[PDB]
A paper describes a structure:
BADHs are a group of enzymes from the aldehyde dehydrogenase (ALDH) superfamily that primarily catalyze the oxidation of betaine aldehyde (BA) to betaine; some BADHs also utilize other substrates. BADHs resemble ALDH in structure and are composed of a Rossmann-fold NAD(P)-binding domain, a catalytic (substrate-binding) domain and an oligomerization (bridging) domain. The solution data are supported by the structural analysis and emphasize the importance of the NAD+-driven structural rearrangements at the cofactor-binding and substrate-binding sites for enzymatic activity.
To maximize the structural resemblance of SaBADH to its native apo and holo states, we determined structures of the enzyme in the absence of BME. The first peptide stretch adopts a helical conformation extending helix αF in the presence of NAD+ and interacts with the adenine ring of the cofactor. Although this segment is unwound in apo SaBADHBME(+/−), it forms a similar helix turn in apo G234S-SaBADHBME(+/−) and apo SaBADHBME(+)PEG.
Numbering used by the authors:
A (entry chain A), B (entry chain A): -4 to 496
C (entry chain B), D (entry chain B): 1 to 496
The structure:
Amino acid sequence: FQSNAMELLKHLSQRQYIDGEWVESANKNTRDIINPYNQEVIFTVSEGTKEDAERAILAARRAFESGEWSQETAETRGKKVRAIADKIKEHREALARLETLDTGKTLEESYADMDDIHNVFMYFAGLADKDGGEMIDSPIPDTESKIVKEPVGVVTQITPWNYPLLQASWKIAPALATGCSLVMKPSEITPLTTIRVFELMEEVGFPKGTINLILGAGSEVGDVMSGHKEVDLVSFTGGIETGKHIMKNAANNVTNIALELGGKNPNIIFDDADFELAVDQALNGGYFHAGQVCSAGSRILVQNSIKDKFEQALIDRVKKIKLGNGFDADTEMGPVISTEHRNKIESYMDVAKAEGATIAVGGKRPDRDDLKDGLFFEPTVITNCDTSMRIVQEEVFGPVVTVEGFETEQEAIQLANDSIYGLAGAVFSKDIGKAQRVANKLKLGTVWINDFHPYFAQAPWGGYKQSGIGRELGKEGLEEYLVSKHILTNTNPQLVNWFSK
Amino acid sequence: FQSNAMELLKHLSQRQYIDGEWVESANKNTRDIINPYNQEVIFTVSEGTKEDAERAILAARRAFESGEWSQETAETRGKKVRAIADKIKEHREALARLETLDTGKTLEESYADMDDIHNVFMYFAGLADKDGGEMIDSPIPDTESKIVKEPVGVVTQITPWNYPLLQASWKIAPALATGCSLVMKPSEITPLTTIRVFELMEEVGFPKGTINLILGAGSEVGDVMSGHKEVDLVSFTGGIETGKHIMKNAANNVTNIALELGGKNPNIIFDDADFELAVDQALNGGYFHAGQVCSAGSRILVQNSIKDKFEQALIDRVKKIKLGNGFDADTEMGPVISTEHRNKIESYMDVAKAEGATIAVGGKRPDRDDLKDGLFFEPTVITNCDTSMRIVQEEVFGPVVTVEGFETEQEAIQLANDSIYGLAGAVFSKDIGKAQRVANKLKLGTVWINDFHPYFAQAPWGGYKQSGIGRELGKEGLEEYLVSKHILTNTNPQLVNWFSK
Amino acid sequence: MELLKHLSQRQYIDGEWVESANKNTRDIINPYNQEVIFTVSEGTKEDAERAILAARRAFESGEWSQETAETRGKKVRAIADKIKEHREALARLETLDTGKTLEESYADMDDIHNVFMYFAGLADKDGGEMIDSPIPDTESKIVKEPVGVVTQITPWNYPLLQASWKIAPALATGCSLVMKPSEITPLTTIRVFELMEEVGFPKGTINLILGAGSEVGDVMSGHKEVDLVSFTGGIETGKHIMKNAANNVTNIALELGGKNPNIIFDDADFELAVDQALNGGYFHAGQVCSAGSRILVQNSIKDKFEQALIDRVKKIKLGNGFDADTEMGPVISTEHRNKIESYMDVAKAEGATIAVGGKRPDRDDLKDGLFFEPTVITNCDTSMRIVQEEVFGPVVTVEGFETEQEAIQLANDSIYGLAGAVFSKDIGKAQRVANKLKLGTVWINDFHPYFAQAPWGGYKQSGIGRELGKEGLEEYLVSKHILTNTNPQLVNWFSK
Amino acid sequence: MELLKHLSQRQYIDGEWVESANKNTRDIINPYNQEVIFTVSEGTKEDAERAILAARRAFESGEWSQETAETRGKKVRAIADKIKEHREALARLETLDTGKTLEESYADMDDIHNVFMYFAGLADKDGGEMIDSPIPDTESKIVKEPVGVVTQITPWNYPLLQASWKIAPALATGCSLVMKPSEITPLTTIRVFELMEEVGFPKGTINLILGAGSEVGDVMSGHKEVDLVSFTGGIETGKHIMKNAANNVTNIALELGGKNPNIIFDDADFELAVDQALNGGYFHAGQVCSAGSRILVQNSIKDKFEQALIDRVKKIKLGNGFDADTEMGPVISTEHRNKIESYMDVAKAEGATIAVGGKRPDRDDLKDGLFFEPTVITNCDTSMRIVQEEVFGPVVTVEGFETEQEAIQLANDSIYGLAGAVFSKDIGKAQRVANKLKLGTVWINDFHPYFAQAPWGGYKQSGIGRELGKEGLEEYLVSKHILTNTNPQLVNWFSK
Ligand code: NA
Ligand code: NA
Ligand code: NA
Ligand code: NA
Ligand code: NA
Ligand code: NA
Ligand code: NA
Ligand code: NA
């Protein structure tokens, strides 16, 4: 099943890309990369050092100052970003396969990511030359005032394992479109598609040092990427505790930060929702990508009048979800990403039971022989819980949902907002007026009305509260990579003569 | 001279303003406030505790959630902000006097601040109802996509002693215009105008808890203001080390931060500049507000061909600068702000000499009997220095300039950018083309061509590098107080049927 | 009424109150009783020519055009405060001149205050753009400048309101203007010009021409020094104005009213729909731009709806706008009332039914005024002239529809495209309908609202351009692309 | 030239290549030698009527108008790539039809590629706005919709370039269009329509009408189903078009050329100014929209400047646009050349001096073509018809000025307002001048540049509206304010 993807690795680079060259780690260290479907070592790549990271940041600064890219016309930068987009489409099949091999998600999930990635690059390619800044009506006579937008500078970018190429395209596109130099480091356990995308960008051609790729989770590599004085912006997508640590580091040089740290996304279902649609979308929110996608709906809030019927209907569908190899077209859910992540998920099951919650279905590794070698976990539904519980307040980022009941509209909103997170959520009801009222009160970066999962390049994505700082995608996403400069010219300068002559 | 201002204090409140009430500190502690012209204790105000700060933040959260202000129409919020602006103008004389009394700057400097403050409020009042968000052309058929702008939420705001009411208006105006609730804490040594502005805002009328005022530098008050979980944005203007500490704290709850930490602002003078203008503006950049204003030009870069002549002409003017009471119309420069700040300035003079720099004039406290009781420091020019020196790389924020020579345009730019700062700077030359080239290469939030000092509400202000994060003033400043929410409605929802039925 | 003893009677040209160049005057009438209440100057085309040339001179001097946007904003705001300050008197004068109820005039005054305040705050918010030039070593900018000299012609229904929509952005942007209100309703406009002089503007920046003199209209639309002609009024006059503006390739902005549909589905809040159908049809005797004369109601509830509407129409209280009990005043003039009567003759000839009203009220206290009964025409169809043509009177037609699709097809079957409503508790549907209607403004479960924050204007024959909002400000600006080559090199295309 | 054996000869209406309804045709000429090179259909007003009704039907079906903006963008991009792909052939065909040098045609092709690519990227970037409503419990939005059906008339100087300026935004926004190129220069337009069919659009979304048939122009400007008429060409035709559009209150966008000043101060880079004065006057034989026929030079260097310019003008190499040595081709047609000759007769009658040129070249190889010598007219003034009127030919006038102020006053003394330049090493001054010029585009130390990223169009009689940039996109959109009352309450104004 996976052997065609295994073939691709025969030609994939194993090294870092620093300052126009594929290089090993300064100490020759390496890391084994695994396929989560069978836990087999499938590739070995360089494990970079903090000096490698250092050298990349300084190369990115040197290229920035040269102006080769930063002072290129916006139109031409747009054409190059478009050329990356065209590469993604041209190598769509291989890229989708490489992503399924590395992360375990189904091939159709990977193809959908490859479509999004193409559109992300294409969107930024188009936006690149559309806004150079503003002319201001100066309140001072005989002055000309303008705001010019410049690339922010050297940017470090840390991407997560869920999921590599898609989140990388969110950061890379705007950075290249605006003229920044970047240093990217993907998750130590999933570097395959990122290494491939760097090979393709190298084919498109960028001046030396504009793009650099650091691999691994080496000692203090993160520190250097978040704390180096030549960095102007650190953009991190991943876990909350690392995110916080990254921000503390960025403070040492008063460096701009952008964070996206996941969330406990609510899926609110009223008793006047289209029922079968809500059940369908509750499965999709809970179990696409094994519940590991950023948009996952792990917190179901359902109105008390239909709660029992919704629970039975959901549980009945969950038992039919097909687990298996992501390359097998019959598979509906692949495995979770690592031993460590599967272990955290298991332990949250113990906490659930101990707290009084009911594991209504799932909650364990599956039996079947073809899944035994893999990092599989059964899709899980947890009932009879409430907001005071750890399993409701803490995000597990696995194929697991909790179900809480609510009596009124006001209670739904209150419960949905009762979390430290604020990334995304949905409201299901045929009463659109009501759904709009709810949407307006939810503290969430994105709200879906009668849908679940949609994100796209045209609109910004990001969190309120502990889910993040800043936005990716849209004009706002482009803005994270820009800095504003006010240039004021006194066209008729006269002596002030404040001080005695 | 100062007795009319002393009269105003007879009716000024001495307390904090928390949740619609003027209150003492929870432990009844107080702090003596000084006039830097004579070091006399002129007022005693409450010294708040961390619990006071806590209570204000929670009151601000409660008011935010009630919607009284946050859900008010933008137009009406604009009218109230306009009403504050009108108060400032109506009480312009008293406010200017109170500011000269507290900070020591000349009365004309204070009147100019009062004009700026009126225009800041008036600008935000006008901008308040001009942008509600965007409609997006959704890439998904039968979806409606919109971005709605909401107030960011609870905001804490820490203002500096240089200078109180002006920097406070930069933060307050956009916060009220967008519908946020705020908690402000001015510098412990200059709370007078801030207390007055709160009395005036109370007259305009805001729902209980929308605005709160905390006084002092109490134990952990800053920590609570920067680290409390109910805060959505911390905005701090002040010293670099406190700024960094504030950001590290804000990270504990992944809270948005906005910082403005001063700079080492360059004033580049070419040999084809209008000479007398450049000398005049070099004095203004170096010595307005005793060199303590955010826009101060402490780093003069002058072309080698006119360096000796520029130095003599500058030194000759510096000896004529009139020091004195800020209420005496003859005064051209008042005192520095505190014993501590004057001490730091003295010690930088020792470091200058030890490093080999020449104190060409000034560098000490003045003799005169009418200045003896005050915190006066002579306007100072430091020659024969270079970029490698601490006195050139570190900002003193006093009435002191350094003079370095440069041979070429390329050297001017290089030297000007050779600092950890990036707030503001100027270029003087009759060759406008050249001045534009230089302006485009300087890493600075604001660049003046043939001028020095101008900031205004219509344009954003803030720093590159260690001078800050974010912007104040302009549409950008308003944006710091807003959060974006993507609402996506599927107008024709259909079952996805990904999972087996 | 005492107000009139202090009000000027002259034109305002180049900083001076002046009579007509031939001393001609015109009598102004109170439609409530047809009494002459004031006499004002009736300008000549030479007066109009003189104001245009003055506006142009002031514009060129730069005193207003080169003033800082912030300061222009502060003066527009001072005008707004003067409106609020003189709110009562202004309301009374509008009611005297136009006949609408005192309450209608108060609401106008509140709107006018907000219109001026909106543009005052917008004045200094956009100077243009910096462009990222595709040519290396070039700087590219777009500067927004005031469009220049602007002529403004306002209608009689909301004289002061429509005036503020034009005056506010013109002043905010730095243009010089020449305004001419409806010849039958100049009072509040004269008064607002007094208020403006109190604020103080450079000579020629604002000018007021009065009347309907011979070729005054033509000079305002066809003079070569005009950069923009802004007209709100009748479609025939509008077309003529645009043809004239064409002689100098002059920018035009037109608002020509419309045949505005009121769509009522059977799942609408029934009582609400009846209430809003009345409001749509009869606020200001149906002479307001946002009036909903074309009612479309779903067949399932058509009979119930017609009966309820008609029963309510019979209770509408006609009377003096100054009396607290009046719910609808008289129509504006003899000619307009005659037009409304002609339109009733067309309805009859086409075979429609006058379910109620259709004539002048009989009552004694109403005898002397220009009153017309609120009227409902039933049993008509889209092919009839009374459905296709707008009368701008206290009259509504009622047609039925079977489906959503049929309601859209009928509502879009007219030459107009200004505004309309959809009433339905199914918000999903109301939105589908609103996205398909060719109207500048669509209301979902409401009727009439307009405000400074959002643009207003028509698709199709209801206009060209927009007023209010940022788009409204933009009619008064022009873009200039200044491109600077920072490293100019010889091209050497032609042999040396 | 071989290219022509494969090129269509018909119109393109409602997804089909069709002849004229009366089978009439017209002969197309190569201005280099006046040979008939192709024969195409000559449409009737009925054909035009049919395309409009087809564009309207397709627009209403929603196949293109309701397609996602992102997908519309991708198809506009595929058109752009087809331009680059067929760059050589297209350049050769433009040169064949218009006579300009192969190098001029290549630059056009590069520009056209960038125009399409710009709008392709702009398509999905702005859907409208959310408004913060001043009314509580209301949601207010402004949705931007395609304007509808658009008629587009392009000129003969840059047929394909001017076509791309109109086609690109129309397609990007979702409009349906009907285009009619200049009757004497249809070749590249026909070819671009073939390219578009290869990309594939819904039937009726694009339509091509050919010729100058009787009342074809009038139907394109006056038909009631048109929402926007976009015309680039002569000022008289433009005015007539606007008067016609007025009959249905139709939006107009006009670009009518101009009398573009080239201002040369005595502190300009002298050699640069001479070089750019030549370029401004004689690129495309001075028939391009951005041509600088009116030279204003400071008196201090006027004599030196005139002599240098004239000496260079004598060396300009006229010839076949396909030969690498040619620097200027022939003028477009017999009529236009005759107009240029008439204008030389006016210069003489007014007493001006033909310093050089002013007639047809005498040489053998040029005998058969529509050649006109590059010409310089000296000793003229602003009061003369030759200074005030534009000929769009290879001719420039030279006038002197004493001061900055006098240069501004002279440059603005014309009925036009399209583009101009200022040359001076004193950038401060050049900027003062540029801010005072009433021109849509001002170049500082350059001449000619225009690009997709910035708007282009005229003040005064040079146009209404703008093309290129965001403002260009906006002519093809219309705003709709949808206001939703989320808590509707009865008003109860009328007694229950
Ligand atoms: Na892996
Ligand atoms: Na946050
Ligand atoms: Na003090
Ligand atoms: Na920074
Ligand atoms: Na009516
Ligand atoms: Na129209
Ligand atoms: Na010409
Ligand atoms: Na015009």
